[PDB]
């Protein structure tokens, strides 16, 4: 399976994979913060009355 990398550049592959992971992770967290009501419960715990 390793033959798939032949003729590719490691720094291209890591730059592409890095850009994907950063994008995916940020999208997932911002989506998750909307659904799970967190940090909104964290903020409420320490908010001033």
């Amino acid at each position: 399976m390793h033959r798939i990398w032949m003729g590719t550049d490691p720094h291209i592959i890591m730059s592409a994979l890095g850009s994907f992971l950063v994008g995916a992770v940020l999208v997932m967290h911002i989506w998750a913060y909307g659904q799970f009501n967190w940090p909104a419960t964290l903020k409420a715990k320490y908010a001033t009355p």
Partner: protein, 39 residues
């Protein structure tokens, strides 16, 4: 570009990295599930 021997070294670390990432993410999801299960 990478030769077949270079590609073999790269593949080994790439598989190792991918697997380790999925392992850490699996622990993250078990922790998240135990905290606020979503189904």
């Amino acid at each position: 570009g990478m030769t077949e021997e270079e590609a073999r070294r790269f593949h080994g670390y790439m598989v190792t990295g991918t697997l380790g990432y999925v392992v850490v993410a699996s622990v993250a999801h078990f922790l998240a599930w135990s905290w606020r299960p979503w189904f």
